[PDB]
Design an enzyme around this catalytic site. Structure first.
Site, PDB file in Angstrom:
ATOM      1  N   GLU B  59       0.826  -1.200   0.000  1.00 39.50           N
ATOM      2  CA  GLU B  59       0.000   0.000   0.000  1.00 39.50           C
ATOM      3  C   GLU B  59       0.863   1.253   0.000  1.00 39.50           C
ATOM      4  O   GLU B  59       0.541   2.236  -0.677  1.00 39.50           O
ATOM      5  CB  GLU B  59      -0.944  -0.022   1.201  1.00 39.50           C
ATOM      6  CG  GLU B  59      -1.749   1.242   1.390  1.00 39.50           C
ATOM      7  CD  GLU B  59      -1.079   2.212   2.336  1.00 39.50           C
ATOM      8  OE1 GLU B  59      -1.161   1.998   3.561  1.00 39.50           O
ATOM      9  OE2 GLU B  59      -0.467   3.187   1.855  1.00 39.50           O
ATOM     10  N   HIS B  60       1.961   1.235   0.755  1.00 36.32           N
ATOM     11  CA  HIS B  60       2.915   2.337   0.712  1.00 36.32           C
ATOM     12  C   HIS B  60       3.463   2.528  -0.693  1.00 36.32           C
ATOM     13  O   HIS B  60       3.503   3.648  -1.215  1.00 36.32           O
ATOM     14  CB  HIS B  60       4.057   2.065   1.686  1.00 36.32           C
ATOM     15  CG  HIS B  60       3.924   2.774   2.994  1.00 36.32           C
ATOM     16  ND1 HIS B  60       4.410   4.046   3.203  1.00 36.32           N
ATOM     17  CD2 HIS B  60       3.366   2.386   4.165  1.00 36.32           C
ATOM     18  CE1 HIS B  60       4.158   4.411   4.447  1.00 36.32           C
ATOM     19  NE2 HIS B  60       3.526   3.422   5.052  1.00 36.32           N
ATOM     20  N   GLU B 136       7.446   5.248  10.879  1.00 34.26           N
ATOM     21  CA  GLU B 136       6.003   5.277  11.097  1.00 34.26           C
ATOM     22  C   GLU B 136       5.605   4.346  12.233  1.00 34.26           C
ATOM     23  O   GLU B 136       4.714   4.665  13.027  1.00 34.26           O
ATOM     24  CB  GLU B 136       5.271   4.901   9.811  1.00 34.26           C
ATOM     25  CG  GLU B 136       3.859   5.443   9.727  1.00 34.26           C
ATOM     26  CD  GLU B 136       3.761   6.655   8.826  1.00 34.26           C
ATOM     27  OE1 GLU B 136       2.677   7.272   8.770  1.00 34.26           O
ATOM     28  OE2 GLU B 136       4.770   6.994   8.174  1.00 34.26           O
TER      29      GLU B 136
END
Ligand SMILES: CCCCCCCCCCCCCCCCCC(=O)OC[C@H](COP(=O)([O-])OCC(O)COP(=O)([O-])OC[C@@H](COC(=O)CCCCCCCCCCCCCCCCC)OC(=O)CCCCCCCCCCCCCCCCC)OC(=O)CCCCCCCCCCCCCCCCC
Ligand SMILES: CCCCCCCCCCCCCCCCCC(=O)OC[C@H](COP(=O)([O-])OCC(O)COP(=O)([O-])OC[C@@H](COC(=O)CCCCCCCCCCCCCCCCC)OC(=O)CCCCCCCCCCCCCCCCC)OC(=O)CCCCCCCCCCCCCCCCC
Ligand SMILES: CCCCCCCCCCCCCCCCCC(=O)OC[C@H](COP(=O)(O)OCCN)OC(=O)CCCCCCCCCCCCCCCCC
Ligand SMILES: CCCCCCCCCCCCCCCCCC(=O)OC[C@H](COP(=O)(O)OCCN)OC(=O)CCCCCCCCCCCCCCCCC
Lengths: 74, 440
Positions: B59-60, B136
């Site tokens: 997804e990143h 993150e």
């Protein structure tokens, strides 16, 4: 002295499990017997010697009493 | 327009199905904007121990360059026409939706076709992204809400894929290579597991033509998950340096199916939510919230309804100081069993109204409508019309709420996750005892 401010303690994670989802006698004999034997072995050499001495003096005193009242020949 | 007529007047969600298995669906409106996005059935629930975190990684990487669109060129498109490209990956869903103008749908769908099919997975880009994901993860470690919820998931679904977090362990993050990412995208981003939702001013036939022109060369016509097991446990990450103590207590709830969700939500609506910066304070109908405002027990509390495909978590999450965890556990369990044993009719009516407002007001704006479309075609298998929701809420009464709460709350082993100065938090035996009433 109530829950909430007993002490300070950090970075400790404890996991548990409901009593209704785990056995109440887990390996009660498979691991219970070796644990009992180890516990007995740890303290036997420091618990027994006084009591065996007590038994020895018990027999010695009782038998010496009974012998002392034996008619004595004299 | 007496409410019910307004509910009937809501336009319906037309649903189609491509030959590849793509469930193209659209809801037509009159707004000059639109939100079009594909929802895929990938997530951490379908990730093994070694693959855990691959979904977040892909997804990143999705937005950072494609094959046809090299790198920022893709982004160069999205900003050029004012589109807002966004993504989110839940434990069981993933989605990439592009807010755009109604006249930019022909291009936007194209971009979507590039994102999910012709991805890049550039090795150097992977290396740049690995440290970003690590930072993150470090940022999320300070998120005392997300951390607590992940603790709850781990301690409730221990030994099952559902216990896995979305981002995955840092070990997997550093270990993951390009081969794992491409294998994951090739295995999970399959056409039958994708739904191309599009809300706003998009005509369904135009959407169908666009999907057939772009999403045609997808997979033809397999991880189907395993039924996860709930395990009533507890995790206590005692850390007294933290200012507040986040606690989350849940029980095995229903799934996306099992209509018992509708009454259950009502029960949650009865408990409600509260935090320090609220309005009425010691006047709100929720006895929990009224007591909290009266004695200032906490700074926040909520009732969640996290429900997965086959199971789900139903319960509460409260943020309070170190000296008031026991009191709020007492009051929360008291409210739960008050609903369980005697729910009354007036509170049920209030819960029905609150649930009605939640469903109605949540579905405003193109983004929530499109998200509802994509999520419903995956979970329920059908976009449930608001009229059906109204009828299902109407069928709920006091006896139904009492019965469903008895089924899901009374004498059930909960899963507890506390983080912070949680020394006051009662032992699991006391909580479980609070999960049953001697008077009843
Ligand atoms: C005047 C005196 C009046 C009576 C006073 C009694 C005081 C204690 C009663 C309360 C109690 O339960 O105390 C805890 C104590 C131990 O509790 P536990 O749950 O067995 O856990 C012990 C260890 O945690 C775990 O121990 P473990 O790893 O060895 O596994 C359990 C068990 C294993 O036992 C065996 O393997 C059985 C061997 C035969 O070991 C025991 O020692 C239990 C023996 C039970 C009989 O209880 C007992 O030992 C029960 C009987 C106590 C009375 C004495 C007779 C022996
Ligand atoms: C008999 C069946 C129960 C009955 O008729 O009324 C239950 C009823 C308690 O109902 P409940 O739904 O468990 O109350 C929950 C409340 O949150 C009140 O409890 P809590 O949430 O504040 O604390 C939880 C838990 C905390 O645990 C305790 O309070 C320990 C209870 C005594 C355990 C034995 C060692 C200490 C003495 O409370 C109890 O266990 C209730 C204690 C009072 C009833 C039992 C009295 C036994 C005396 C011997 O008992 C009473 O209200 C007391 C008078 C009637 C029973 C005694 C006669
Ligand atoms: C020492 C041996 C046990 C002495 C006491 C016996 C009285 C009854 C004890 C009891 O409730 O269970 C004893 C034993 C172990 O049961 P447990 O493993 O705790 O739970 C099994 C759940 N299916 O389970 C049984 O004996 C039968 C279980 C069925
Ligand atoms: C002798 C009986 C009491 C001692 C043994 C039982 C005990 O200590 O606790 C169990 C029992 C039930 O109540 P408990 O679950 O502890 O708390 C109320 C529910 N939240 O607590 C009791 O007090 C049970 C007996 C009275 C009812």
């Amino acid at each position: 002295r109530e829950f909430g401010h007993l002490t300070r303690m950090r970075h400790v994670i404890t996991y548990s499990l409901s009593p209704f989802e785990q056995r109440a006698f887990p390996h009660y004999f498979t691991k219970g017997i070796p644990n009992v034997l180890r516990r007995t072995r740890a303290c036997i050499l420091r618990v027994a010697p006084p009591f065996v001495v007590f038994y020895l003096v018990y027999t010695w005193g009782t038998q010496e009493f009974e012998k002392s009242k034996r008619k004595n020949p004299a | 327009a007496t409410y019910a007529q307004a509910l009937q007047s809501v336009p319906e969600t037309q649903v189609s199905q491509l030959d590849n298995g793509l469930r193209v669906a659209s809801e037509q409106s009159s707004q000059p904007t639109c939100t079009v996005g594909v929802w895929i059935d990938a997530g951490s629930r379908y990730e093994n121990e070694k693959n855990n975190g691959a979904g977040y990684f892909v997804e990143h990487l999705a937005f950072k360059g494609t094959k046809n669109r090299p790198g920022s060129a893709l982004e160069k498109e999205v900003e050029s026409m004012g589109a807002h490209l966004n993504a989110y990956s839940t434990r069981e869903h993933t989605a990439y939706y592009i807010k755009a103008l109604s006249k930019d749908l022909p291009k936007a769908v194209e971009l979507l076709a590039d994102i999910v099919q012709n991805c890049s997975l550039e090795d150097s880009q992977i290396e740049k992204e690995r440290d970003v994901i690590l930072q993150e993860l470090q940022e999320n470690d300070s998120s005392m809400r997300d951390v607590v919820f992940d603790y709850l998931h781990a301690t409730a679904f221990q030994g099952t894929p559902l216990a896995q977090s979305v981002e995955g362990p840092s070990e997997n993050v550093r270990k993951l290579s390009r081969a794992d990412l491409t294998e994951y995208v090739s295995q999970h981003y399959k056409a039958p597991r994708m739904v191309l939702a599009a809300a706003g001013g998009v005509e369904h036939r135009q959407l169908l033509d666009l999907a057939q022109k772009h999403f045609s060369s997808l997979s033809g016509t397999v991880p189907a998950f395993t039924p996860c097991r709930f395990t009533g446990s507890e995790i206590r990450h005692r850390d007294d340096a933290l200012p507040l103590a986040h606690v989350a207590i849940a029980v095995e709830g229903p799934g996306w199916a099992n209509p018992d969700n509708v009454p259950l939500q009502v029960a949650n609506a009865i408990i409600g939510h509260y935090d320090s910066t609220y309005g009425g304070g010691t006047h709100m109908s929720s006895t929990l919230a009224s007591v909290a405002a009266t004695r200032k027990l906490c700074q926040s509390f909520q009732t969640f309804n996290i429900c997965y495909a086959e199971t789900g978590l139903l319960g509460a999450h409260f943020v309070c100081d170190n000296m008031s965890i026991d009191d709020m556990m007492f009051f929360l369990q008291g409210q739960w069993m008050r609903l369980c044993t005697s729910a009354t009719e007036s509170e049920v009516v209030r819960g029905k109204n609150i649930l009605r407002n939640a469903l109605v007001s949540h579905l405003d704006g193109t983004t929530p409508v499109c998200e509802d479309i994509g999520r419903s075609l995956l979970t329920y298998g059908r976009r449930i019309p608001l009229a059906e929701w109204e009828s299902r809420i109407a069928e709920v009464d006091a006896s139904v709420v009492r019965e469903v709460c008895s089924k899901y709350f009374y004498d059930q082993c909960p899963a507890v996750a506390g983080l912070g100065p949680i020394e006051q938090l009662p032992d699991y035996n006391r909580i479980r005892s609070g999960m049953f009433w001697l008077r009843f």
